Amino acid sequence: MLAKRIIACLDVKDGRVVKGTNFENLRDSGDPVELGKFYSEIGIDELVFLDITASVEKRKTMLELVEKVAEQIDIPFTVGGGIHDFETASELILRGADKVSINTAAVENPSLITQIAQTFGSQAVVVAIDAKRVDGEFMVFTYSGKKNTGILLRDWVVEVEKRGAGEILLTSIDRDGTKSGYDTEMIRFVRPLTTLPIIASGGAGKMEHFLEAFLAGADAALAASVFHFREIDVRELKEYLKKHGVNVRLE
């Protein structure tokens, strides 16, 4: 039975993990490839690399990252952050990335979802949706959560599926970096609108938040600081979820 996934998010900049890492066992705090290689060793199900390199270098830098990562990690990974066209995505997938994450570019050119899906298959497309409550309604926000698009989340989710996307990365802007729990209301809201796999993102602070997210209907749960800072052990988290009737991958 398809396991519910624990996903680690590596925020990279120029080819380095941001705010380092408590893993002094490693030989680097913030080497994205060693950390990723490590996350596999300890039981992470998937990796997500989010680049924020000032676009001067960004295009070369992300291909650098992808080539070095594919060469060493043995779990599925995903690159995203400023992938603006089929060109950028094609060369990134070809460089070794299992999937690419598109957001702002997708909202502004939905056909892009299809463009990648037809060449590389729906499996290779992940659409990131950053949502936030504006006047009682769930609205979709582009440009790293700063521009309100006027597009209702209810609509964009159905569209993304129609477009040929293979997976949705749902981030609650209201909860991102709050360690207070995932936005389960938002997950429950989206769950019925689509059959696509949903990754919960934003708010993770401890083990129970993960269970709450899976009850809400998430197919995966993504986190960063809580993992990088040794705030939650991966094997323990999975032992805990299994105990409470969630189907996780346990080795």
Binding site: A70, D74, I75, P76, Q123, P197, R249, E251
Partner: protein, 193 residues
């Protein structure tokens, strides 16, 4: 120990080269070649449409190269699409497969496709039970005689792993299956001895 990985495609096959080089580390006198013609102890048939690749094995005079391997009690291991090619036909309507193992290929009964993510494989023997990384739409149909590993997706139980003598087939991606994939690949190497 000569290992050959058929490099002609389709798909990314280098993630597999890396995974195999990775698993072969602790092993003595080991060689790994990317393959597209005649020269192996362990032959890998990788790939990620049944039509393509079945074409590419023709267009590279490899159908006989593989036939000669099976015939010579050499190990022949199909991975992903490579596994489906071991069979007689797929639903690529009209194309003959390698017909190395009796059976055919068929779309999965699920409304949700592709089957994508970590799913449990349960082996009859030898290989490590546990979760492996899957990404496929079509499944094999064969005799219990040739079933090696089993997996359930959406209430449908199918051969996630297959075996006719020294011919092996795996439907998942060992090279993307973390520690257990490495262990699986090690055991495949340990078998070809």
């Amino acid at each position: 120990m000569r290992i050959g990985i058929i490099s002609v495609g389709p798909g990314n096959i280098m993630n597999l080269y890396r995974g195999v080089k990775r698993a072969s580390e602790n092993f003595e006198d080991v060689s790994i070649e990317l393959v597209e013609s005649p020269r192996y102890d362990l032959l890998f048939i990788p790939g990620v449409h049944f039509g393509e690749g079945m074409r590419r094995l023709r267009e590279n005079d490899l159908i006989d190269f593989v036939r000669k391997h099976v015939e010579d009690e050499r190990y022949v291991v199909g991975v992903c699409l490579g596994m489906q090619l071991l069979f007689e036909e797929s639903e690529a309507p009209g194309v003959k497969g390698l017909s190395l193992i009796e059976g055919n290929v068929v779309k999965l009964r699920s409304r949700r496709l592709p089957h994508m993510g970590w799913n449990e494989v349960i082996f009859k023997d030898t290989f490590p039970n546990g979760y492996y990384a899957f990404v496929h739409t079509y499944r094999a149909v064969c005799e219990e005689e040739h079933v090696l590993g089993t997996t359930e997706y959406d209430g449908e139980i199918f051969p996630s792993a297959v075996r006719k003598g020294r011919i092996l087939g795996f439907q998942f991606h060992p090279e993307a299956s973390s520690k257990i994939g490495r262990k699986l690949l090690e055991k495949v190497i340990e078998c070809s001895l």
